[PDB]
């Protein structure tokens, strides 16, 4: 009963309301919170740990699923073409949309009574969380089918299973390429990139590929990049009127906006041509997630930063200093030391009034408080946790795209030519995209190029 009760009875761990709160004036009220499922329920022996429902591998499991029954449902079993299932009721200018899901309590239906548009079905259950995410999922679904189609004309003798598997292998590789070549260098900056991700040598079976408990909380740094609006742009990269800036508190689980308000193309243009929010020590996270998170589907609007902090506690994560020590970073003991670490005394003062000791600072809070590394969007501590996790995901993956036996020298040489703007070109009506690096390019027309200039993926090395 966590959704409506304020009683602290397992599995409820409600967030108590402080006095003089800017939004919640009822101190008897609370912010709902369910403790993460324990790996070993009811045990008085084991130290409580949480479960990862997904494959840790950068294997495009948000597309294919991490469970075989789901993985099967997401597939098109009507033929031998190796495709993923598509929406049978709607299309985006003749282009595929994700299938709908059949949920007991569907949140998308709540975002708009008249529209009656349910949640989408993908490899990961959070696909309908925000239309920007849905758009990325919809893009990858289209890319699999596009690959399965090309491979069929190349190898007509291949069956559905072969086609499904071969396209999946390519999609997984493309996620790995975009993430390690374009994304992480821009998260960590160059020195952390060299420190935590040195040149790939080969697969090593002694590298634990599992996602660490701390990683589930440290990677939430991305919450500091969130803008308070969903931006939709037209063909000419101009605000798509009416409603070009929709407040985020009106887009969570709003699958109707994708179906009835223009498809994925305006959402993707908005993502490419709009700057991300810059994390500043006095501008950490916006009120659309801090005050109005899931406001139209819940009894009360949640606080994403506070949920992260309660989550780290639920997960029994050590505090800030324990992680700094783990990273081999200087451990501040007092406000003056923390001030030096954050290169900001006002924030250290602010933090110490709350925690009393840098030992008690919640990992997300401490992590996002640190001054960003040169050409990176995280501090030393998050660069260490993030960098450490991704090295393990790369060096401990037997199916890493660069590993001997996974692909041929020619297939690798071909894969090296892929990019996210090209994926957009091949699967949308968008003809002008971000110049590489896509994650850096944010101004139209300055950082924009035509599709023709971008090299397509040559599948010649895949002909049997």
């Amino acid at each position: 009963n966590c959704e409506t009760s304020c009683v602290q009875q397992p599995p409820c761990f409600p967030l108590k309301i402080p006095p003089n709160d800017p939004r919640i004036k009822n101190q008897a009220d609370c912010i709902p919170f369910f403790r993460s499922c324990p790996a070993c329920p009811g045990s008085n022996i084991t130290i409580r740990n949480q479960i990862n429902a997904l494959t840790s591998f950068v294997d495009a499991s948000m597309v294919y699923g991490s469970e075989e029954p789901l993985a099967r449902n997401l597939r098109n079993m009507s033929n031998q073409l190796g495709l993923l299932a598509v929406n049978q009721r709607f299309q985006d200018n003749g282009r595929a949309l994700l299938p709908f899901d059949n949920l007991h309590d569907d949140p998308c239906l709540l975002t708009n009574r008249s529209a009656r548009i349910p949640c989408f079905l993908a490899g990961d259950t959070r696909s309908s969380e925000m239309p920007e995410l849905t758009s990325m999922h919809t893009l990858l679904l289209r890319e699999h089918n596009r690959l399965a189609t090309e491979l069929k004309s190349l190898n007509p003798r291949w069956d559905g299973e072969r086609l499904y598997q071969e396209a999946r292998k390519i999609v997984g590789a493309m996620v790995q390429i975009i993430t390690y070549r374009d994304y992480l260098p821009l998260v960590l900056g160059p020195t952390a990139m060299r420190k935590y991700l040195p040149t790939y040598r080969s697969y090593n079976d002694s590298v634990d590929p599992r996602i660490a408990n701390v990683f589930t909380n440290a990677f939430r740094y991305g919450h500091t990049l969130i803008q308070p609006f969903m931006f939709r742009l037209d063909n000419r990269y101009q605000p798509m009127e009416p409603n070009p800036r929709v407040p985020l508190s009106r887009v969570f689980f709003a699958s109707w906006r994708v179906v009835l308000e223009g498809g994925i193309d305006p959402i993707l243009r908005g993502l490419m041509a709009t700057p991300a929010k810059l994390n500043r020590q006095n501008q950490i996270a916006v009120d659309e997630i801090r005050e109005r998170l899931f406001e139209q589907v819940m009894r009360i609007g949640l606080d994403l930063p506070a949920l992260n902090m309660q989550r780290s506690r639920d997960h029994g994560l050590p505090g800030y200093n324990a992680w700094r020590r783990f990273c081999g970073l200087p451990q501040p003991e007092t406000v003056g030391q923390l001030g030096t670490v954050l290169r900001n005394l006002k924030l250290a003062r602010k933090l110490m009034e709350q925690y009393g000791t840098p030992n008690n600072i919640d990992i997300w809070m401490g992590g996002v408080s640190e001054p960003l590394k040169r050409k990176g969007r995280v501090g030393p501590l998050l660069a260490c946790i993030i960098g450490t996790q991704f090295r393990k995901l790369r060096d401990g993956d037997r199916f890493w795209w660069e590993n001997e036996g996974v692909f041929s020298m020619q297939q690798r040489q071909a894969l090296a030519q892929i990019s996210l703007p090209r994926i957009i070109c091949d699967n949308t009506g968008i003809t002008t995209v971000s110049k590489n690096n896509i994650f850096m390019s944010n101004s139209y027309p300055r950082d924009f190029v035509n599709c023709s200039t971008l090299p397509a993926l040559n599948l010649a090395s895949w002909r049997e």
Partner: protein
């Protein structure tokens, strides 16, 4: 666990041949440090009123959010060198790595 394979399994099982569940779905997370709970093994810090963490009262997540995270929306600084695509790939990537189930 096959001695030779061309493709990944859906669950991630058999990726590591020596420890075939490593990186596979529906498995406990690895810990890089031992957990820190109010009772040592299950209760979260903040569960019991009056119980301190490292000799200090436990701050309310909402109070930390109110005092440290809160800022005026109009003041938002856009990133001159990052697109929203950088944000969106991050969340999409996150959803390839971890999902922590609730009851």
């Amino acid at each position: 666990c096959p001695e030779q394979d061309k493709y990944r399994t859906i669950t991630g099982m058999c990726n590591n041949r020596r420890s075939p569940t490593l990186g596979a779905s529906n498995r406990a997370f690895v810990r890089w440090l031992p957990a820190e709970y109010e009772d040592g093994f299950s209760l979260p810090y903040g569960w019991t009123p009056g119980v301190k963490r490292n000799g200090f009262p436990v701050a309310l997540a909402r109070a930390v959010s109110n005092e440290i995270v809160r800022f005026p929306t109009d003041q938002l600084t856009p990133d001159q060198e990052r697109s929203l695509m950088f944000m969106q790939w991050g969340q999409l990537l996150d959803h390839d790595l971890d999902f922590t189930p609730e009851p």
